[PDB]
Amino acid sequence: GPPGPPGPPGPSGPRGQPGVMGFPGPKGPPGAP
Amino acid sequence: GPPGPPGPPGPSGPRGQPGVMGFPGPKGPPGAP
Amino acid sequence: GPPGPPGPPGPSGPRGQPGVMGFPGPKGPPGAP
Amino acid sequence: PCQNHHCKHGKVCELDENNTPMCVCQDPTSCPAPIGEFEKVCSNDNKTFDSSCHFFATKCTLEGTKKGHKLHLDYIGPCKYIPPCLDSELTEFPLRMRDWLKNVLVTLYERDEDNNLLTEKQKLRVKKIHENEKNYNMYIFPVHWQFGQLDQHPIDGYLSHTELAPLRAPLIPMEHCTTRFFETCDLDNDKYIALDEWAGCFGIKQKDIDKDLV
Ligand SMILES: *[C@@H]1O[C@H](CO)[C@@H](O[C@@H]2O[C@H](CO)[C@@H](O)[C@H](O)[C@H]2NC(C)=O)[C@H](O)[C@H]1NC(C)=O
Ligand SMILES: [Ca+2]
């Protein structure tokens, strides 16, 4: 006879790529007196 | 009867991890003399 | 008939979050004498 | 026949003489070349590897050496020179990091969409910490929260050297002072850092040490 139903959904995709480096630190604090 | 067609693709994987931390900000300017 | 083979693995994850903002810049040179 | 087998860090899937999944050590040779310089890791011996994988698959098929006991994965980045932590800097330091923690926290408050990064309680200590177009009255939580994150193997109130890795490693090559700052936190030299050691290190009086913030 004719073909039977279509298999289940497959595996979850893999993890994404790592984001980019982060905004540079703020400016350092002035060398007091 | 032969086996049906393969099924949907698995739900999308998980958002990749974050990225390395940022560079230290710039050396602060000079102060009271 | 037989249910077909499981789906294929899904879509890769999205890109990650950007890293963390770096350290604040070093201290400031002590003003001129 | 393999997709459904996940092997520990360092191992991969290879089929045994019966076609039934098993786990053996990885051919370091077959890992992704560093996508940049960042992907590389340094090692106790100022000796560079191309990636995490590359260190595992090396170390994996190893064990019980004495020249290897004194060899562990030192930090992310490739192996560079690290200048000495001068006392001037090693002081100027807790004040910088703890500030950085504050930001680290705040830079999370933003990304957290449904208690995935901060609880609700915390998200509301940060709230009361953010709103400040005004100093010590902030750092308190950060420092703690940080300590929280670490002490975890096992949770006991102390910080093993291994428990620091995830902060010491990614950090050393941006802050030479890092290695120093963490050994001179362990006041009593217990080779561990206890919350007290850890709070006073960041300039936090013991009257604010609220052991519930972790
Ligand atoms: C570890 O190895 C690195 C790099 O292989 C060394 O850093 C170098 O130092 C010399 C100066 O003597 C420079 O010419 C190189 O360009 C430096 N590399 C860098 C960081 O770009 C470092 O001296 C070694 N450190 C040790 C002995 O632990
Ligand atoms: Ca612990």
Please report the DSSP string for C1-33 in residue order. -PPPP-----PPP---------PPP-PPPP---
Query: Which stretch of DSSP H or E encloses residue D101?
Result: helix D94-109
Determine, for residues B11 and C12 on separate chains, whether the beta-carbon distance falls below 8 Å. Answer: no
Chain breaks in chain A (C to N over 2.5 A) after: none
**B23 vs D contacts (CB less than 8 Å):** 174
3-class SS at D145?
A: helix
Token pair listed for C2: 């037989």
What amino acid is encoded at A28 in this protein?
A: G
**B20 vs D contacts (CB less than 8 Å):** 38, 76, 170
Residue with tokens 């083979």: C5
Q: Which residues fall inside 5 Å of ion ligand 2, going by CB?
A: D 151, 156
CB neighbour burial string for D104-117, b if at least 16 within 10 angstroms, e if fewer: bbebbbeeeeeeeb
Q: How far apart are CA D154 and CA D156, in angstroms?
A: 6
Determine, for residues C23 and D89 on separate chains, whether the beta-carbon distance falls below 8 Å. Answer: no
D82-214 placed in CATH 1.10.238.10: yes
Q: Do residues D123 and D112 make contact, with C-beta atoms less than 8 angstroms apart?
A: yes
Q: How far apart are CA C14 and CA B14, in angstroms?
A: 7
Residue D193 phi/psi, 5-degree rounding, is -110, 120
Q: Do residues D145 and D199 make contact, with C-beta atoms less than 8 angstroms apart?
A: no
DSSP β-ladder status, D21-25 and D11-15: antiparallel
Query: Which stretch of DSSP H or E encloses residue D14?
Result: strand D11-15
Q: How far apart are CA D117 and CA C7, in angstroms?
A: 32
Fold exhibited by the domain D1-81: Wheat Germ Agglutinin (Isolectin 2); domain 1 (3.30.60)
Q: How was this structure determined?
A: X-ray
Q: Residue D84: how many CB atoms within 10 A of its CB?
A: 10
**C27 vs B contacts (CB less than 8 Å):** 27-28
Q: Do residues D168 and D41 make contact, with C-beta atoms less than 8 angstroms apart?
A: no
Based on its alpha-carbon atoms, the radius of gyration of chain C, rounded to whole angstroms, reads 27
Token pair listed for A13: 């995709």
Domain with CATH 3.30.60.30 in chain D: 1-81
Which residue, by CA, sits nearest to atom 12 of ligand 1?
D81
Q: How far apart are CA D59 and CA D9, in angstroms?
A: 10
Q: How far apart are CA D48 and CA D164, in angstroms?
A: 21
> Which residues 85-104 on chain D approach chain A with CB closer than 8 angstroms?
100
* List of residues 6+ apart from B12 with CB closer than 8 A: A12, A13, C10, C11, C12, C13, C14
Q: How far apart are CA D186 and CA D201, in angstroms?
A: 8
Length of chain B: 33
Query: Which stretch of DSSP H or E encloses residue D23?
Result: strand D21-25
> How many angstroms separate the alpha carbon of residue D79 from the centre of ligand 1?
8
Q: Do residues D40 and D48 make contact, with C-beta atoms less than 8 angstroms apart?
A: yes
Domain with CATH 1.10.238.10 in chain D: 82-214
* List of residues 6+ apart from D141 with CB closer than 8 A: D105, D122, D125, D126, D129, D213
